A paper describes a structure:
Toscana virus is an enveloped negative-strand ribonucleic acid (RNA) virus that belongs to the genus phlebovirus in the Bunyaviridae family. The genome of phleboviruses, like other bunyaviruses, is tightly packed with N into ribonucleoprotein complexes (RNPs). In this study, we have elucidated structures of the hexameric RNA-free (apo) N and of hexameric N in complex with a single-stranded nonameric RNA. As in the RVFV N structure, each N monomer consisted of a core domain comprised of two α-helical lobes (the upper and the lower lobe), and an amino-terminal α-helical arm which was divided by a short linker, hinge II, in α1 and α2.
Using an unfolding/refolding protocol, nucleic acid-free N was obtained, as judged from the A260/A280 ratio of 0.6. The apo structure contained 12 molecules of N in the asymmetric unit, which were organized in two hexameric rings. In the hexameric rings of the apo structure, an almost perfect six-fold symmetry between the six monomers was observed. Oligomerization was driven by the amino-terminal arm, which bound into a hydrophobic groove of the neighboring monomer at the outside of the hexamer (pockets I and II in Figure 1E and F). The interaction of helix α1 with the neighboring monomer included hydrogen bonds and hydrophobic contacts, and a salt bridge between Lys83 and Glu29 of the opposing monomer. In the apo N structure, Tyr32 from hinge I, Lys204 from the lower lobe and Lys79 from the upper lobe of the adjacent subunit are in close proximity to each other and cap the RNA-binding tunnel. In the absence of RNA, Tyr32, Lys204 and Lys79 localize closely together in the RNA-binding tunnel. Furthermore, it can be envisaged that the proposed inter-subunit shift is energetically not favoured over the planar architecture, since we do not observe it in the apo N hexamer.
Numbering used by the authors:
A (entry chain B), D (entry chain E): 4 to 251
B (entry chain A): 5 to 250
C (entry chain F), F (entry chain C): 4 to 250
E (entry chain D): 4 to 252
Write the structure that this text describes.
């Protein structure tokens, strides 16, 4: 009954933006820890008699083409390929979807080891669920092969000058709205507004990743062709972003 | 023959006050703010713990992740998911709106609103409905203070000139979008049906006997909704007239 | 030996509207018996050692504010109040909705003991699901507080001169179309035509009630302010009815 | 193995139109015998002290307002009325739905004693499940009160000149598609095509009724206002039929 | 490998249209065996014993008017007629729908003993679910009474010269699209395209029937009035077919 | 600890272009091996009776008309035909659907032995689930009988000049969207967009088949009438493709 004084005295408490924003980044939506993924791949890989660095490449390529269901893709695959996939499931304990944070999935391998994933996309652009030529028709120009995977969202700096990261994020969104339509045909009927909201939460988690620094992401964006040394966005990036803005 | 038993009920003591004493007793009340503060105080100090900081953390956790403690942990940083699990243990956190003595993250923000109303000034862009989003929907920069259902617990409806009704409508401009986000099934519905989905528990917070009419006056002034001369901010009135257009 | 002679002769058979209408009202839709409700409240109240006349008042007030779901309203109510509600559920065996005719619900208590319900509305007009000031905005004038509940339909005489009962019925319909929109938000999207048909069957049952006589209903309408002794409708009633006819 | 020759030999087998039509008269879809209903009402009514001619009226009025479930309607009815209903159930052995042909239901009483049922509808038009004013809104004009019951189908002559009987049948169908929507809300979602066929089998049985002759039905249609002495359809009938044809 | 050379050599492999159609009809969808139906009616009928030739007539007439649900039609029928129906269910073990091939249904009796079914339709044209006058309004002329039942599909030769069998099949389809709309009210809402596909599989089975020969069907089509001795289609048949083609394609 | 550096060290990593595509062709979606099907038909066929080359023909005809459920189609088939079907199930161990890759199904026989399947369609066009005349109505012209089966997708070269393979693929898609609607009536309600995505994965597997060479598929397309010797698409093919693009 006299709890009025207790609640009213919370009007003057520390509402500092330092610890509060420190808590939101702590309570931030995080599907998995990239540091944990690399560790478990390294540990379970070297303790098993394996060249994990090669297996990482194979798991990424496997994920970029077949998806994230290791047990399901084996039933419809060449026995020559289905054999080594069964191996990768055994040694690295592969699971499907997004379960626990210490469980290794094919999508998290591509997200953790993105600097190689961003290079593999440059090659097998026509073997993706959404082909390269398809994105070249949707966009006004030839859509950047680097952005043709959700793992690309883990190397984009939103704190770039002039808000360049927001432009790249929108440019990357042009692919994601089609990638979501393909991997989930139920979203095809929905317009771009509803589709964009189906991934804007886990994708935003990769953008605000504390795994790569602001300078590390700068090197990654330059070396792949999204941006140059003078931090100037490519013509393909800006034109792909303005087409995404025309869908919101 | 049962007419006299029933028809003679015309002269019965329609005592004004005791009838309303039953009405104020039967009023729709999701929870008791006095009970929430007590249980946070008791279970917090009996556990050897700094509850005042935990209140801050529980409010921040609620303002960003929602009201499902067990569900938000599965998709959160282990550094953060650890202390959330702590808050669930000591204060016995539950989800939704169950019993009145069960502490939920939404009730902590509602009970300890004077701090919740200050936190919104900071993490405006981390909310389910971002600050800039409300700045586009409203004609001006929508008051950050109103960007949570807990704001309804500090608004005086008995304000002169029906100013409380204006603030209530201004707060409704956010709630119709907050309901659309936390529940995408209401997105298809127009503003009329969405406004009726919260107008019952929200009205309960407005007619709260927890804060007095004078206590709510101090809270509205210190946060920027109204001034000392009881004059509504330009952002409040313009946000209300846009809600009346729905 | 009974081919056409019996059935074909029913063209010459009488079908006057005097005896027929008495059978329709006899064969009428009846949600519950007001005589049965009062009896069960009286019996179960005095046999349990409590003042039922006070409980009747509390059950009516409880119904006028919270509705007709006793088990649900307790979960969101003050423990001081949720305690005495649990009591009312125990002794009078309260149920929800409109089940059997001998099952006592909060809505039937207000309907049976309407002469007190019609007085309580004069007080708690702003605590109703549809507030008094709300009806004052919808109607051209201050809408009669007496009509602010479906229980009011049980005291209106349709056999009033000049069809005055039809006017009061329409005036009462102005509230019911909004009361149905509030207690059931799914009807909010529907226009007044579809909403009016959602209650025009149980409400018509209360209008043609054989519980109160034509003279008893006359006394009730006068003592509450709907009509005067000269059977002249109040200005608030007629103006509220003409707004309902426009829907 | 020579069974092929046996079936082919049915070309010369006899099939005169007299005996064949004699078999269809045994196989025609008949829910009940109107002659049997009238007899049982007369017998069981006169074998008791009951005035059956008055009870027939009450059973028809009871059916036109409450339906065809005597045991169920009593539980939600005034005790003054529920008392005499219980009586009608006792003496005439009333049942519900469409069971045996020798079992008397409230719907069959209205169908057998239709010349009185067709007159009662003129009075209690606003007490029906489908009100009179409702049919006045659906149809372009004031829909004939006589047609506001499935029992009306038992007095319409399909062998009328210029196919006038087909017009009245369609005009009566405008009410039945709404009557079926009300007594069975599950058919409300269905469009008029599916609803019209839910009754087109028992209704067609009443149309081809050998109970009333072609001349007896002529007298009934004239005396109630559906058609005049020169066999000219009323303006309300034809306009209600053309609105029903706009639903097929 | 050498299996590519092996598989590619199936281009030079023989595939005459004669043996293929024999495999199509051999691997064909078959609801029941007409030979089996006649046998079981003969055996179970004479062992009672029954005048089965008369019972066949009654079962056909019963099917042409009430349908294919013996247990259901009895509940709404005159006791004088419902009695002999109950008998037919007992002796010939009548079932409903299309279950096993050795189970006798009222629809299969009319299909097996079609030469009598095709004659009965000439009489009870106005007692059918789809009346004769109804088909006379839908079609430009008086629609052939012979075609007013799905059993008619069992006597039409598709191998007739000038593709005349395809014309009769389309002419018979004009009735089937309305017969399906009546016996199944859910198909009324659907257009003729979707309705025509609901029966085009069991109906095609009756057309390619090895029960009646190409010549036996010729005698049947002539004796009932669909075609003449010079294999010239009736004016009513062709005009009913061109009206069916204007809904289909 | 410094697992960040490890991830960044994959920037200057040996990312090939040959071996990667070698992994893609290894991980490519493959329902079955056409080489394996022909082998098992040859082995299990000669090891019992038997004229397998005739059985291949019968199994193809059986698949083109009844589908891919050997055990189910027997229950509704002539005993004369159901007998030899039971035989084919015995000797070649026939199963249904798409299980293992070493299990022989009726759909895989038609896909493996497509050069004969592509000739049978020219005859039994009106016995198919989707009749020939039906496709003649959907398309502006007489739709190529050769394309009237999913097995046709195994002989189309996507690496054809002027992107002709993409045109034939779209032309073949005009039939598949109707074939999927018939064999699975649940897809009938769905529009062409959703239906086209239900088969675009196993069908694309047949298009990129390493079984037939680019030159072998050329001979097959010419000899059946889809394309001529000058690699010019038939008028029926291009017009059927532009109608598929309209969906």
């Amino acid at each position: 009954e006299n709890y009025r004084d207790i609640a009213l005295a919370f009007l003057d408490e520390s509402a500092d933006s330092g610890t509060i924003n420190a808590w939101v980044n702590e309570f931030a939506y995080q599907g998995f820890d990239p540091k944990r993924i690399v560790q478990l791949v390294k540990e379970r890989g070297t303790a098993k008699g394996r060249d994990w660095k090669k297996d990482v490449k194979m798991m990424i390529v496997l994920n970029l083409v077949r998806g994230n269901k290791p047990e399901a893709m084996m039933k419809k695959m060449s026995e020559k390929g289905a054999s080594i996939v069964a191996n990768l499931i055994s040694v690295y304990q592969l699971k499907e979807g997004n379960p626990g944070r210490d469980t290794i999935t094919l999508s998290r391998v591509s997200a953790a080891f993105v600097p190689w994933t961003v290079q593999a996309l440059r090659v097998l652009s026509e073997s993706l669920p959404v082909s390269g030529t398809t994105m070249d028709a949707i966009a006004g120009v030839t859509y950047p092969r680097a952005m043709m995977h959700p793992s690309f969202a883990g190397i984009i700096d939103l704190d770039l000058p002039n808000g360049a990261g927001a432009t790249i994020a929108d440019a990357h969104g042009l692919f994601m709205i089609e990638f979501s339509k393909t991997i989930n045909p139920s979203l095809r009927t929905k317009q771009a507004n509803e589709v964009a909201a189906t991934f804007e939460k886990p994708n935003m988690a990769a953008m605000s990743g504390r795994f790569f620094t602001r300078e590390d992401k700068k090197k990654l964006l330059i070396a792949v062709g999204i941006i140059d040394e003078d931090l100037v966005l490519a013509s393909a990036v800006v034109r792909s972003a303005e087409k995404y803005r025309a869908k919101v």
